A paper describes a structure:
Murine mAbs [name] and 2D9 have a similar specificity, both targeting Tn-[name] in the GSTAP region; 2D9 requires N-acetylgalactosamine (GalNAc) to be O-linked to both Ser and Thr in GSTAP, while [name] can bind GSTAP when it is only singly O-linked to GalNAc. MAb [name] has a relatively high affinity for Tn-[name] and has been observed to induce antibody-dependent cellular cytotoxicity. In order to reduce the immunogenicity of the murine [name] mAb while retaining specificity and binding affinity, humanized anti-Tn-[name] Abs were generated based on the murine [name] mAb. The [name] mAb was humanized from the original murine mAb specific for the immunodominant GSTAP glycopeptide epitope in the [name] tandem repeat by the mutation of surface residues on the framework regions of the variable domain dimer and the use of human subclass IgG1 and κ constant regions for the heavy and light chains, respectively.
The structure of the humanized Fab from murine monoclonal antibody [name] specific for tumor antigen Tn-[name] has been determined to 1.57 Å resolution. Despite undertaking thousands of crystallization trials of the humanized [name] (h-[name]) Fab in the presence of either the singly or doubly glycosylated peptide antigens corresponding to Tn-[name], the Fab is only observed unliganded in the crystal. Interestingly, the single Fab molecule in the asymmetric unit of space group C2 is observed packed head-to-head with a symmetry-related Fab across a crystallo­graphic twofold axis such that a polypeptide loop from the light chain of each Fab is observed to insert into the antigen-binding pocket of the symmetry-related Fab. The conformations of the complementarity-determining regions (CDRs) of the combining site on the h-[name] Fab do not differ significantly from those reported for liganded murine scFv at 3.0 Å resolution. The domain shift of h-[name] from the parent murine Fvs is about 1.33 Å, which is about double the average domain shift observed among the six molecules of the murine [name]. The humanization process has imposed changes in the framework regions of the Fv which may have affected the Vh–Vl interface. While the affinity of the murine [name] has previously been reported as KD = 1.7 nM for the 24-mer Tn-[name] peptide PPAHGVT*SAPDTRPAPGS*T*APPAH prepared by in vitro glycosylation of a synthetic 24-mer [name] peptide, the KD of the h-[name] Fab for the shorter doubly glycosylated glycopeptide antigens PAPGS*T*AP and APGS*T*AP was measured here as only 41 and 61 µM, respectively.
Residue numbers in the entry:
A (entry chain H): 1 to 130, 136 to 216
B (entry chain L): 1 to 219
Write the structure that this text describes.
């Protein structure tokens, strides 16, 4: 089974550097070039360069040449992408992948967030219930970095749940709401608890939302 | 550098109907040595890496069904998806594989077109817990509507707000092809406690009249 496993998400301040790794397995490392492709939030794919491990052919997009360095550790079947003098434009998902179009395998992506924000778990506030349908929810405010996960009633409630994509606020912290619609006749009998997990800060909040 | 320009930027196609996505390159991608066009198509769903669909302009990747078809030559290429399915909702990219730097088109986002569906609107005042913090968030929810275009206006004591709200929209629901949207108005506690009537007014193609949901602070 061919696998490309990338290193975890990173937060860096502007001007810093980041080095992302890409561990290849399930094939002979020197059989394919490793390409690096990134994608800023909501934007198009962008090709950064490639490293061909068998013969050390390294090619860069001039947009990144001199700020990015591609290397490999052939002994560990690992490719690296180092990006220096980080800027706001560099907040993005970074992917490694094999070959051009002859061996379609991609790593799972590494999110690099360029920010001066400190890691912070969210404040969780109720969106209380005010046609037999009632809407309720949780406002998941002021956390950093991405991502958060939200479940309802420990995963027992999934129908009608909408957990919105996060927005970045002017504070540099993210915010989102998770909402669910339920029968009004259940409001007095069924407890509704949003389970908010923010793994970067190891925070877990279970907030009961009451009418 | 080869510039790759896709058209349209977004496409809404009914289930079972044909989607057509065009990709134009600023230079020919036809390789004299093998007479192949080095044009590649990828499918990318949110949160996932792209997936190879077609290469050499018209050769389908193994595992890709034959309702995906690539055509064209030189500078003008087309991806046709026949009998569109919900699992085809994605952003599609063409890529220049002819000469460095390898460059991508800007993407074409495909969604399912369905009959117009009006949003169900809900408003939520800020929680007492949040108010202790000096900032107040007021949330307006537009639930399960199509198409995605919608106008959400905040009114405070009937004054139209500007600059102090942010919107978030879901991806398309795979089973019913709808969107939901949140608009969040952020005020200082001082401003929140100064004013009384909080309203969000929603305009949408499915509504013959705009829908307003409102509350009076403290009720």
């Amino acid at each position: 089974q061919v696998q490309l496993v990338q290193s975890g998400a990173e937060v860096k301040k502007t001007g810093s550097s980041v080095k992302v790794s890409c561990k290849a397995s399930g094939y002979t490392f020197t059989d394919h070039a490793i390409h690096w492709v990134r994608q800023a939030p909501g934007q198009a794919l962008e090709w950064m360069g490639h490293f061909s491990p068998g013969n050390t052919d390294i090619k860069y997009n001039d947009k990144f040449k001199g700020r990015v360095t591609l290397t490999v550790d052939r002994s560990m079947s690992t490719a690296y992408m180092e990006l220096s003098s980080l800027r706001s434009e560099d907040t993005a998902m970074y992917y490694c992948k094999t070959s051009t179009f002859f061996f379609d395998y991609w790593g799972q992506g590494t999110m690099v967030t360029v920010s001066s924000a400190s890691t912070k778990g969210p404040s969780v506030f109720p969106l209380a219930p005010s046609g037999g349908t009632a809407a309720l929810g949780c406002l998941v405010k002021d956390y950093f970095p991405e991502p958060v996960t939200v479940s309802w009633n420990s995963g027992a409630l999934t129908s009608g749940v909408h957990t919105f994509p996060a927005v970045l606020q002017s504070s540099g912290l993210y915010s989102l709401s998770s909402v669910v619609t339920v029968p009004s006749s259940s409001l007095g009998t069924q407890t509704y608890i949003c389970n908010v997990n923010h793994k970067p800060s190891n925070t877990k909040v279970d907030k009961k939302v009451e009418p | 550098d080869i510039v790759m320009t896709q058209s349209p930027d977004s496409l809404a196609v009914s289930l079972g109907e044909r989607a057509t996505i065009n990709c134009k390159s600023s230079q020919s991608l036809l390789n004299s040595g093998d007479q192949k066009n080095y044009l590649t198509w990828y499918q990318q769903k949110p949160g996932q890496p792209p997936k190879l669909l077609i290469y050499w302009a018209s050769t389908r990747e193994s595992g890709v069904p034959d309702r995906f078809s690539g055509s064209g030559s030189g500078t003008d290429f087309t991806l046709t998806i026949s009998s569109l399915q919900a699992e085809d909702v994605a952003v599609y990219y063409c890529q220049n594989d002819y000469s460095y730097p390898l460059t991508f088109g800007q993407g074409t986002k495909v969604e399912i077109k369905r009959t117009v569906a009006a949003p169900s609107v809900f408003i939520f005042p800020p929680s007492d817990e949040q108010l202790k913090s000096g900032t107040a968030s007021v949330v307006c929810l537009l639930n399960n509507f199509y198409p995605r275009e919608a106008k959400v206006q905040w009114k405070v004591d009937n004054a139209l707000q500007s600059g102090n709200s942010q919107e978030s929209v879901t991806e398309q629901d795979s089973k019913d092809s709808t969107y939901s949207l949140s608009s969040t108005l952020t005020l200082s506690k001082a401003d929140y406690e100064k004013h009384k009537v909080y309203a969000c007014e929603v305009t949408h193609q499915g509504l013959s009249s705009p829908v307003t949901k409102s509350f009076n602070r403290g009720e």
